[PDB]
Amino acid sequence: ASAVVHPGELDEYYGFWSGGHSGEVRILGIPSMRELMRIPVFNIDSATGWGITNESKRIKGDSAHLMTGDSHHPHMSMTDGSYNGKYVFINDKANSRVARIRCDVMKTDKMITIPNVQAIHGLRVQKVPYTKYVICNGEFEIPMNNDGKASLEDVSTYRSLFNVIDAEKMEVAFQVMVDGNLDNTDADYDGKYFFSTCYNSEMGMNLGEMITAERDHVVVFSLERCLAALKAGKFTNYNGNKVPVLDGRKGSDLTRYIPVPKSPHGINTAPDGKYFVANGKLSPTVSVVEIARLDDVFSGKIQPRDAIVAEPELGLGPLHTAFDNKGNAFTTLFLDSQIAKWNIQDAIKAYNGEKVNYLRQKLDVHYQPGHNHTSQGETRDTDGKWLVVLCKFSKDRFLPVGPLRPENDQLIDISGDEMKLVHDGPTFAEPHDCMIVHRSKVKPQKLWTRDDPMFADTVAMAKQDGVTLEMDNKVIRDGNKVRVYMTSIAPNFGMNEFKVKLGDEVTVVVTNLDQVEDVTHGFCMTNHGVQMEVAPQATASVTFIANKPGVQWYYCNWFCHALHMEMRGRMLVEAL
Amino acid sequence: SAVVHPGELDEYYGFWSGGHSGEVRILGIPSMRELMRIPVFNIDSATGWGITNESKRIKGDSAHLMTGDSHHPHMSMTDGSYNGKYVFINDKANSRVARIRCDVMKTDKMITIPNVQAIHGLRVQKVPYTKYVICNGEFEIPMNNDGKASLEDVSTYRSLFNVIDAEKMEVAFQVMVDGNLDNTDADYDGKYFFSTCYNSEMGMNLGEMITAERDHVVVFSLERCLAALKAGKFTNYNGNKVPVLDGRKGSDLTRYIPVPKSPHGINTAPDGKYFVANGKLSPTVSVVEIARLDDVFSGKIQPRDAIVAEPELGLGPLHTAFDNKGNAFTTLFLDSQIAKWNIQDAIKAYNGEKVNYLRQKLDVHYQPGHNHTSQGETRDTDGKWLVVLCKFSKDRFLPVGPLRPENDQLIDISGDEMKLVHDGPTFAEPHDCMIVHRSKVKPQKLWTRDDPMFADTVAMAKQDGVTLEMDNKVIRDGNKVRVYMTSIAPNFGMNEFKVKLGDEVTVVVTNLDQVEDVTHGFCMTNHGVQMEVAPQATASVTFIANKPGVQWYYCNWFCHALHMEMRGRMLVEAL
Numbered sequence A: 001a002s003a004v005v006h007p008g009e010l011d012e013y014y015g016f017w018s019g020g021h022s023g024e025v026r027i028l029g030i031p032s033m034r035e036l037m038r039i040p041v042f043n044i045d046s047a048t049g050w051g052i053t054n055e056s057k058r059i060k061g062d063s064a065h066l067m068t069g070d071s072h073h074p075h076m077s078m079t080d081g082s083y084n085g086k087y088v089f090i091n092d093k094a095n096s097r098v099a100r101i102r103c104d105v106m107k108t109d110k111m112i113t114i115p116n117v118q119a120i121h122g123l124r125v126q127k128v129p130y131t132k133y134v135i136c137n138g139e140f141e142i143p144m145n146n147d148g149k150a151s152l153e154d155v156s157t158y159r160s161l162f163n164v165i166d167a168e169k170m171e172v173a174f175q176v177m178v179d180g181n182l183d184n185t186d187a188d189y190d191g192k193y194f195f196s197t198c199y200n201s202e203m204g205m206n207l208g209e210m211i212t213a214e215r216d217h218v219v220v221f222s223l224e225r226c227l228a229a230l231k232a233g234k235f236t237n238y239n240g241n242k243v244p245v246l247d248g249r250k251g252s253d254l255t256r257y258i259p260v261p262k263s264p265h266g267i268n269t270a271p272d273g274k275y276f277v278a279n280g281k282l283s284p285t286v287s288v289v290e291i292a293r294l295d296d297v298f299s300g301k302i303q304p305r306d307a308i309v310a311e312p313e314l315g316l317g318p319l320h321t322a323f324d325n326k327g328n329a330f331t332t333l334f335l336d337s338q339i340a341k342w343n344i345q346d347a348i349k350a351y352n353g354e355k356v357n358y359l360r361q362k363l364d365v366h367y368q369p370g371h372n373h374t375s376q377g378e379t380r381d382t383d384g385k386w387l388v389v390l391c392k393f394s395k396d397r398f399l400p401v402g403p404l405r406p407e408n409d410q411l412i413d414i415s416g417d418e419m420k421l422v423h424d425g426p427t428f429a430e431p432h433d434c435m436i437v438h439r440s441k442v443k444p445q446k447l448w449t450r451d452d453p454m455f456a457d458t459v460a461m462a463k464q465d466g467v468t469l470e471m472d473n474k475v476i477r478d479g480n481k482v483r484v485y486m487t488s489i490a491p492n493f494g495m496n497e498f499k500v501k502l503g504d505e506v507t508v509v510v511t512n513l514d515q516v517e518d519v520t521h522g523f524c525m526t527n528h529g530v531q532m533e534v535a536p537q538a539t540a541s542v543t544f545i546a547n548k549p550g551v552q553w554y555y556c557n558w559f560c561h562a563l564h565m566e567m568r569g570r571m572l573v574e575a576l
Numbered sequence B: 001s002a003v004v005h006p007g008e009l010d011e012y013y014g015f016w017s018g019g020h021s022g023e024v025r026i027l028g029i030p031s032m033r034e035l036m037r038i039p040v041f042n043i044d045s046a047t048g049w050g051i052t053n054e055s056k057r058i059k060g061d062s063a064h065l066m067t068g069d070s071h072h073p074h075m076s077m078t079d080g081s082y083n084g085k086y087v088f089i090n091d092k093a094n095s096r097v098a099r100i101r102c103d104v105m106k107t108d109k110m111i112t113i114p115n116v117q118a119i120h121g122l123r124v125q126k127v128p129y130t131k132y133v134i135c136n137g138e139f140e141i142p143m144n145n146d147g148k149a150s151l152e153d154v155s156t157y158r159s160l161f162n163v164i165d166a167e168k169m170e171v172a173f174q175v176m177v178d179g180n181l182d183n184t185d186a187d188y189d190g191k192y193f194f195s196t197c198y199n200s201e202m203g204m205n206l207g208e209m210i211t212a213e214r215d216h217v218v219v220f221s222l223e224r225c226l227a228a229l230k231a232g233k234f235t236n237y238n239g240n241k242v243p244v245l246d247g248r249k250g251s252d253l254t255r256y257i258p259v260p261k262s263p264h265g266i267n268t269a270p271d272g273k274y275f276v277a278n279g280k281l282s283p284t285v286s287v288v289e290i291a292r293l294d295d296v297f298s299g300k301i302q303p304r305d306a307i308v309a310e311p312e313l314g315l316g317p318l319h320t321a322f323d324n325k326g327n328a329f330t331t332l333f334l335d336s337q338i339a340k341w342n343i344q345d346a347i348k349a350y351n352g353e354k355v356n357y358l359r360q361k362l363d364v365h366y367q368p369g370h371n372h373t374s375q376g377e378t379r380d381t382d383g384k385w386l387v388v389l390c391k392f393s394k395d396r397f398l399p400v401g402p403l404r405p406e407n408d409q410l411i412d413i414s415g416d417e418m419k420l421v422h423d424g425p426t427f428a429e430p431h432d433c434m435i436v437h438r439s440k441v442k443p444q445k446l447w448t449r450d451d452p453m454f455a456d457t458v459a460m461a462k463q464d465g466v467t468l469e470m471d472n473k474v475i476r477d478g479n480k481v482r483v484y485m486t487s488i489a490p491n492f493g494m495n496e497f498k499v500k501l502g503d504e505v506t507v508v509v510t511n512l513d514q515v516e517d518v519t520h521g522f523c524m525t526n527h528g529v530q531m532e533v534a535p536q537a538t539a540s541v542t543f544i545a546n547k548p549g550v551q552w553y554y555c556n557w558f559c560h561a562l563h564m565e566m567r568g569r570m571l572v573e574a575l
C-alpha cells in the first residue's frame, strides 16, 4: 500500500516490538514505522522512574535489584485466534523472567522469575479457545538441583524445561522436562498442542558438540495429556518451590519428538491452523508439519517423521517464517540475506515427487535477517498487507554513527502478492521479534483511576497514616522515616517546602489531580538520582536517603504548563 | 522533499536531547529516524553503560546515580562552524555536564558542577572555537549549603553561571549573579556570553517569581572575567578549587539588560549581529544588538540601550531560531504556533515605520517549546529545515494510554511559506536539539586498542601479566577473581571457568573481530549483568557470584549465524 502517514493522518496498526538488549517493549505505528512509545519492563527507565519507584519495584518482586534485561518475544492475548487487546506478554532471556503489560494503561503490571530454568527464549500465547496459557522455553541446560555440589559438572543431570504460565494469574501452571534444549515455540489453533524447536539435542557443552547432529527435533506437547498427568499427581517439585514439573523426555507419553534438520530456530503456525513450519538454520530447508497428523503420532499409528508433509530447500540460513492470507510463506535467509516467498501447497506437491516450483520470489534484504512478521499474521485475521523483516546488520543503509550501528527493520508491501521494499527503519539494541495488530483491536484509556491495583499498596500505606491522597499535603514522621504526601495540579505542587533531618529516609508520594489527558507531571529531587512520572489521576512514590545537608530543590521535570519551571519547592535538610 | 527512500541517506545528523530518559539520540534529517541512542545519564541495559567498569569510571563521583534529564546537546565549533569533535550535554536533574566523543559516539567525560543546583541552559563558545562550554545553574542555593543558619535564609541563596574548559572537561570559573539563570548563548566574536533570568525576584514560590514586569538578560564579558581571575579576584567555596567571580549587579564583569517577563530562550542570530531573548509571560521578544555591548560595558550607553526592537508576536514566546535570510522563527507556546518574522522590519517598526514584520503564523500541534533550524546555530545556516519540539501530541498519533509521546514537527522553510511535512512521535520530552550537515561528522568504524576509554582496564590486565589481544586466563586474588577472555564470533575463548560461591568476579572481554559492527555482548544469566563488547574494544563488569551451581554466560548480540551457541559456563562451587 502507501506507507506514508502524513501529518494529521493516523497509522493503521500498532506494532509491539521487542526492545532487544534495552529490556523495554516499544509501540510502533505501522506503516509509518515511527516509535509511538517505550514501555519500561526489565530496564531502569530514567524517564518514568520504572525500576526506582516503589510501585515498579513492587511489581518486579524478587527481581527489583536487577538493572538490566533482554526483552525477547512480545505477544498479545487472543480470543478464538484473534487479538483481544488485553495484555502483551514479554520475556527476559537474560534473567529468566516473564512480564505482563496491561494494554489499558500500557504499563507492566506483573513480573515473575521462572524457577528451575536458565534463559527464557521463545515465548508465544495460546490462541484457542483464548490465551489461557502463555508458553515459553528454557534455552540453557542446568541441573534441577543446581546447588554447586555433585551436579555442578555432571552434564547427565542438566535439563531444559518448557514452561506453561497461567496468563490471567501470571503464575507458572506447570513445567515439562524435555530431552535436549529449547529455542522457539508456538501453539496450534485448536487448544490441543504446543511445539518447540531444539538446537542442542546433543546436550553439547560447546559449539562443535551442539552442531554434530544432522537432525535435532521439534518437541510437541499434548496439553490434554499434561493436564491429566498433573491431575493424577505424576509430577515432581524441585528447589523447594511448588511448581509441578512433568517428565516429557523421550519415553514419556506427554510429548513426541519430530526429527528436524539442523539446529533449527523458528517455529511458526500457519494461520489456517493446518501446519507449522520449523526453520532449518544450518540446513537450507524448512520442515512443514501437518497438525492434523499429531494425534496419530501420539497414538503411535504413524512415526513422528510421518507428520512431515514438506521439507523444501529455500536457501542458506533459514531462521523464521511468516504467512500471508493466501497460502504463502515468507522465510528469512540469514546467510543469503533474502526473504524467500514460497507456496505451502506447492511445497507439499514437490515433497510428494511432483515437478512443481514452490518458490515464488526472493527479495534481497539489508542485511542478515532474523525474524519476519506479517500484519495480523499470527492470528486468523492475517490480512496479507505488510511484512516486516528484522535485519541484524545495517552496514551502508544509514549515515554512519560509529562502531555500534543500528539494526534495520525493513517494511515490505506484500499486498500485491509481489514483494516491494518500502522503508528502512533504523532500530536500537536488536529487536528479536514483534507483532502487528490492527488499531481497532487495541483501546487504551486516557486517565488512570484511583482504585488502580498498580498503586494500591501505596494507597494502603497512605490510609494507615490517615492520609487521603486526593486531598492532603502532609508530612508524616516515623522516627528516621519521613513520608511526604503531596498533590500536584499544574503548575503547582501542594507544598512549597518541607523539612527533614540529615540522614532521614524520605519517601515522597505524589498524586496528580489534573483531569485532562496527557497532562503528565514529574517529581525530581535535584542531585539525588531520583525522578519519576506522575500521570493524571495516578499516585507515584520514591524512597531515598536525605544524605545531603541544606537546601535541596524538588521540581516537576515534565513540561505540564507554561509555568512548569516555577513548579518547584525546597526539601530543607537540617544539619545534625 | 523529506522522503529518504531505502538506499538513500539522510543529509544531516540531528543530536537530540533524550529529555527525561537521560540519553542523547542521533537522528537522520530529514527522515527524522532515530539512528542511535548514546547512553549518558541513564543506565543502559543494551550496552551496559552505567554498570560496566569503564562507564562507572567515566561517571566518577556520580556512578551511583541511575537517572538524569538530558537537556541541551551542542557540538563543538571552529570559527562558528561545527567541527564534529564533541557533543556536550547537561543533566539538569543532578547538575552534571558530559562530553560525547563523535569519533566513537560515546560519552568520554562527565563532571558534577559544584556549588550549584540544576544545570539548565548549555551552549558552546562559537569563535574562535569551542574553548569554553557555558551553562547555567537554574536554582538558588547557599554557597555554604550546610543545613545550618543559611538553610532558610533566602538572602544567602545564589545562582552561578558556569564556564567549562571544553578540552579539559574541568570548570574554568563560575560567575555569581543576582537572580537565577535559565538559557544561555554565545556571540560570534568570543567576547560575550549571555543568559536569561526568570527569577530576578529571588522568589521562593510561583507568585513571587512572576511579580516583576521585567527580569533581565545578564551579559558576561569574557575578557573582564579572565582579567579578574588572573588578578586573584575570586573566592573558593565548599572546599573545592573552582574560582567564583562576583558578577552581581554593579560588578564590572556583567551587565543586566531589563527584559519582560520571566524570559526563557536566548538565541544568537547567525550573522552575529543580534541575540533574541524570548518573552514567555510577555508576548514579545527583545532584540539586542551585539555590537552595542562594548558601550554597555564602558558606560557610554546604558543596558536598556542595547535593545533595538521588542516586537509583539503572540502568546507565550519561548524560543527563536533563524534562517539564512534575516528571518526568525519563534515558538508561541500558548497560541500553539510558530511566528516567522523579519528582524530588520521589527527594528524599523520599533522606530515608528509603518512596516509589517510578521510574515506568517503556522499552527503546530501542540504547545511548542524549542525550535531549531538546519545548521542554524552556526555560520552555515542554510534555511532548509525547521524542527519544532511540541510538548502535547493530543490526537496526532494513535492513542497509547495515559502517557503520550511528544511531537517533533518537521517544517520545510526553504520557500517563502512554512510547510508542515512530518509529525515525529518522541519519548520523554526532548528539550533541545541541533542539526549538523553530514559532511562535518566523520565517525570511526572500529575501536583501537589504545583508546583511553578502557585504558584503566588494560592497565589492570598488565598488572596481572595479561595481554588482552592473546589471553584467556583466570586470575585468583583472595575472594576476587578476574577472568580475561577473548571473543571472535562465534566463540568465546573460554567455554567454562570455576569460582567459589561469594567470589567477587570481574569479567573482562576483548572482541578481536576486525570487521566493522560485528558487535558482541557478554551476559551472565540471572545476575543482572550484560554489556556491549565492540570490535577491538575491551569491556568489563564486576558482580558477586552469589548463586551456586551452573551459571551460563552468553553473547546476547546477534554477531553470527551461530551466536546462540556462543555461550559457556561459570561453575560456582558450593562452600
Ligand SMILES: [Ca+2]
Pocket (backbone or CB within 6 Å): A199, A200, A201, A202, A210, A211, A212, A213, A215, A216, A262, A263
Ligand atoms: Ca544440534
Ligand SMILES: [Ca+2]
Pocket (backbone or CB within 6 Å): B198, B199, B200, B201, B209, B210, B211, B212, B214, B215, B261, B262
Ligand atoms: Ca520573574
